[PDB]
Design an enzyme around this catalytic site. Structure first.
Site, PDB file in Angstrom:
ATOM      1  N   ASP A   1     -11.328  -4.029  15.894  1.00 37.04           N
ATOM      2  CA  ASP A   1     -10.264  -3.015  16.016  1.00 37.04           C
ATOM      3  C   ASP A   1     -10.258  -2.042  14.817  1.00 37.04           C
ATOM      4  O   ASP A   1      -9.204  -1.752  14.259  1.00 37.04           O
ATOM      5  CB  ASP A   1      -8.887  -3.717  16.224  1.00 37.04           C
TER       6      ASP A   1
ATOM      7  N   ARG B   1      -5.108   3.646  12.349  1.00 30.98           N
ATOM      8  CA  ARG B   1      -3.800   2.959  12.347  1.00 30.98           C
ATOM      9  C   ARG B   1      -3.851   1.593  11.620  1.00 30.98           C
ATOM     10  O   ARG B   1      -2.808   1.088  11.199  1.00 30.98           O
ATOM     11  CB  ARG B   1      -3.257   2.785  13.797  1.00 30.98           C
ATOM     12  N   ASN B   2      -5.074   1.017  11.466  1.00 30.15           N
ATOM     13  CA  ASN B   2      -5.297  -0.280  10.834  1.00 30.15           C
ATOM     14  C   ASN B   2      -5.748  -0.191   9.376  1.00 30.15           C
ATOM     15  O   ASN B   2      -5.957  -1.223   8.736  1.00 30.15           O
ATOM     16  CB  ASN B   2      -6.244  -1.154  11.691  1.00 30.15           C
TER      17      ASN B   2
ATOM     18  N   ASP C   1      -5.149  -4.708   8.804  1.00 29.57           N
ATOM     19  CA  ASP C   1      -4.720  -5.429  10.008  1.00 29.57           C
ATOM     20  C   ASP C   1      -5.884  -6.177  10.636  1.00 29.57           C
ATOM     21  O   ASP C   1      -6.971  -5.630  10.711  1.00 29.57           O
ATOM     22  CB  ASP C   1      -4.108  -4.470  11.031  1.00 29.57           C
TER      23      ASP C   1
ATOM     24  N   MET D   1       0.872  -1.177   0.000  1.00 31.53           N
ATOM     25  CA  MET D   1       0.000   0.000   0.000  1.00 31.53           C
ATOM     26  C   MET D   1       0.908   1.225   0.000  1.00 31.53           C
ATOM     27  O   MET D   1       1.484   1.591   1.026  1.00 31.53           O
ATOM     28  CB  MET D   1      -0.966  -0.065   1.210  1.00 31.53           C
TER      29      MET D   1
HETATM   30  C1  LIG Z   1       2.793   2.264   7.996  1.00 28.42           C
HETATM   31  C2  LIG Z   1       3.301   2.228   6.539  1.00 28.42           C
HETATM   32  C3  LIG Z   1       2.743   1.259   5.680  1.00 28.42           C
HETATM   33  C4  LIG Z   1       3.179   1.094   4.345  1.00 28.42           C
HETATM   34  N1  LIG Z   1       2.680   0.159   3.470  1.00 28.42           N
HETATM   35  C5  LIG Z   1       2.140  -1.045   3.769  1.00 28.42           C
HETATM   36  N2  LIG Z   1       1.469  -1.787   2.853  1.00 28.42           N
HETATM   37  C6  LIG Z   1       0.866  -2.938   3.218  1.00 28.42           C
HETATM   38  C7  LIG Z   1       0.993  -3.400   4.538  1.00 28.42           C
HETATM   39 CL1  LIG Z   1       0.274  -4.907   5.010  1.00 28.42          CL
HETATM   40  C8  LIG Z   1       1.744  -2.666   5.459  1.00 28.42           C
HETATM   41  N3  LIG Z   1       1.893  -3.069   6.757  1.00 28.42           N
HETATM   42  C9  LIG Z   1       2.546  -2.417   7.787  1.00 28.42           C
HETATM   43  C10 LIG Z   1       3.629  -1.531   7.548  1.00 28.42           C
HETATM   44  C11 LIG Z   1       4.323  -0.904   8.599  1.00 28.42           C
HETATM   45  C12 LIG Z   1       3.978  -1.176   9.928  1.00 28.42           C
HETATM   46  C13 LIG Z   1       2.951  -2.094  10.191  1.00 28.42           C
HETATM   47  C14 LIG Z   1       2.210  -2.697   9.146  1.00 28.42           C
HETATM   48  S1  LIG Z   1       0.955  -3.892   9.607  1.00 28.42           S
HETATM   49  O1  LIG Z   1       0.754  -4.865   8.541  1.00 28.42           O
HETATM   50  O2  LIG Z   1       1.358  -4.492  10.875  1.00 28.42           O
HETATM   51  C15 LIG Z   1      -0.585  -2.952   9.814  1.00 28.42           C
HETATM   52  C16 LIG Z   1      -0.528  -2.137  11.135  1.00 28.42           C
HETATM   53  C17 LIG Z   1      -0.984  -2.109   8.575  1.00 28.42           C
HETATM   54  N4  LIG Z   1       2.276  -1.518   5.014  1.00 28.42           N
HETATM   55  C18 LIG Z   1       4.160   1.955   3.845  1.00 28.42           C
HETATM   56  O3  LIG Z   1       4.539   1.754   2.504  1.00 28.42           O
HETATM   57  C19 LIG Z   1       5.409   2.608   1.725  1.00 28.42           C
HETATM   58  C20 LIG Z   1       5.864   1.758   0.505  1.00 28.42           C
HETATM   59  C21 LIG Z   1       4.680   3.907   1.269  1.00 28.42           C
HETATM   60  C22 LIG Z   1       4.696   2.952   4.685  1.00 28.42           C
HETATM   61  C23 LIG Z   1       4.308   3.090   6.036  1.00 28.42           C
HETATM   62  C24 LIG Z   1       4.940   4.226   6.893  1.00 28.42           C
HETATM   63  C25 LIG Z   1       6.477   4.446   6.696  1.00 28.42           C
HETATM   64  C26 LIG Z   1       6.979   5.591   7.637  1.00 28.42           C
HETATM   65  N5  LIG Z   1       6.149   6.814   7.446  1.00 28.42           N
HETATM   66  C27 LIG Z   1       4.680   6.679   7.668  1.00 28.42           C
HETATM   67  C28 LIG Z   1       4.116   5.550   6.751  1.00 28.42           C
END
Ligand SMILES: Cc1cc(Nc2ncc(Cl)c(Nc3ccccc3S(=O)(=O)C(C)C)n2)c(OC(C)C)cc1C1CCNCC1
Length: 303
Positions: A151, A155-156, A172, A101
């Site tokens: 939930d 954040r999810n 999530d 994402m």
């Molecule tokens: C939180 C996040 C998510 C993504 N992309 C992404 N795509 C799919 C999933 Cl499944 C996912 N999971 C994720 C990522 C980081 C932390 C926790 C999760 S998780 O699956 O445990 C859920 C809480 C979404 N991230 C992401 O992707 C980039 C490629 C834009 C970036 C971020 C942060 C990076 C630091 N600055 C704020 C945004």
């Protein structure tokens, strides 16, 4: 091996698509999940993926929780729920491969895309209503399939891209997994419960129905329209608990149109029977998007 049941259909570890370890490349860290780092990755024109990892130093319960998460996500089939590309469980550390994402999580998107003097219209009321509709669509699919998320929170939720055309999705299912496995919560305790997103019957009686998700959805709506503020500003978990049980409700976020705030208040009805289901929530969001007085409302500009 544990079995998993969804929409009256049983699945197990053997139904997960094991992707060869040699076909996966980690690119960068994106932050941490419930238990392990999440990476941006590639699966071999490579498939862009989010790679959830399982720490090699973990208990047998952590291993079973990780497997259950993979089973849960792999069984959903909806445009507003992150897809599972596959898993890599036959190599260590174990991986779950999910749809990348590119807009990141919704909470950080709202906080970072907030209109500023530098970004006069980074974001408008219609962008917020589209995120809300997208998530309500995913919740409707869970409700129709008798799955209680437990939930629903900013954040999810994740976004496909930062710019126009973005689609919001539920990314999530850690809470629902915890309940499916043990029946209760679990790995955490009182201090870890998402109290600020829960209705009275949930934190008091432990009663969970799809009307639980309706309440959390109302809280998510406030998070969306406040542009990423933490719910119940300046209140702790116990103050919220007491405030909400005594009938207390959040005020409208800054510049929130009345029809939008009305959806939140309906989601927050004390009796679950008085709360709308997701089909009614969608109809109301759709009516808000049609109304010029709602969509022409300027978002507050943060100096
Ligand atoms: C939180 C996040 C998510 C993504 N992309 C992404 N795509 C799919 C999933 Cl499944 C996912 N999971 C994720 C990522 C980081 C932390 C926790 C999760 S998780 O699956 O445990 C859920 C809480 C979404 N991230 C992401 O992707 C980039 C490629 C834009 C970036 C971020 C942060 C990076 C630091 N600055 C704020 C945004």
């Amino acid at each position: 091996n544990p079995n998993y049941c969804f929409a009256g259909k049983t699945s197990s570890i053997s139904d997960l698509k094991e992707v060869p370890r040699k076909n996966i490349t980690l690119i960068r860290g994106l932050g941490h999940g419930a238990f392990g780092e999440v990476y941006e990755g590639q699966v071999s024109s490579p498939l862009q993926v989010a790679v959830k990892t399982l720490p090699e130093v973990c208990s047998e319960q952590d291993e079973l929780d990780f497997l259950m998460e993979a089973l849960i996500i792999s069984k959903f089939n909806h445009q507003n729920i992150v897809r599972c590309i596959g898993v890599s469980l036959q190599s260590l550390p174990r991986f779950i491969l999910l749809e990348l994402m590119a807009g990141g999580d919704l909470k950080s998107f709202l906080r970072e895309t907030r209109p500023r003097p530098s970004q006069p219209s980074s974001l408008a009321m219609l962008d917020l209503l589209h995120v809300a509709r997208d998530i309500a669509c995913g919740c409707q699919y869970l409700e129709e399939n008798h799955f209680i998320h437990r939930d629903i929170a900013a954040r999810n939720c994740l976004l496909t891209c930062p710019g126009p055309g973005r689609v919001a999705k539920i990314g999530d299912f850690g809470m629902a997994r915890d309940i499916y496995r043990a029946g209760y919560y679990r790995k955490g305790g009182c201090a870890m419960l998402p109290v600020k997103w829960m209705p009275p019957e949930a934190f008091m009686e432990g009663i969970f129905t799809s009307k639980t998700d309706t309440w959390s959805f109302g809280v998510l709506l406030w998070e969306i329209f406040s542009l990423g503020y933490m719910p119940y500003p300046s209140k702790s978990n116990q103050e919220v608990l007491e405030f909400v049980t005594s009938g207390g409700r959040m005020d409208p976020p800054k510049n929130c149109p009345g029809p939008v705030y009305r959806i939140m208040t309906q989601c927050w009805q004390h009796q679950p029977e008085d709360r709308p289901n997701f089909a009614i929530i969608l109809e109301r969001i759709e009516y808000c998007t049609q109304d010029p007085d709602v969509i022409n409302t300027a978002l507050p500009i943060e100096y």
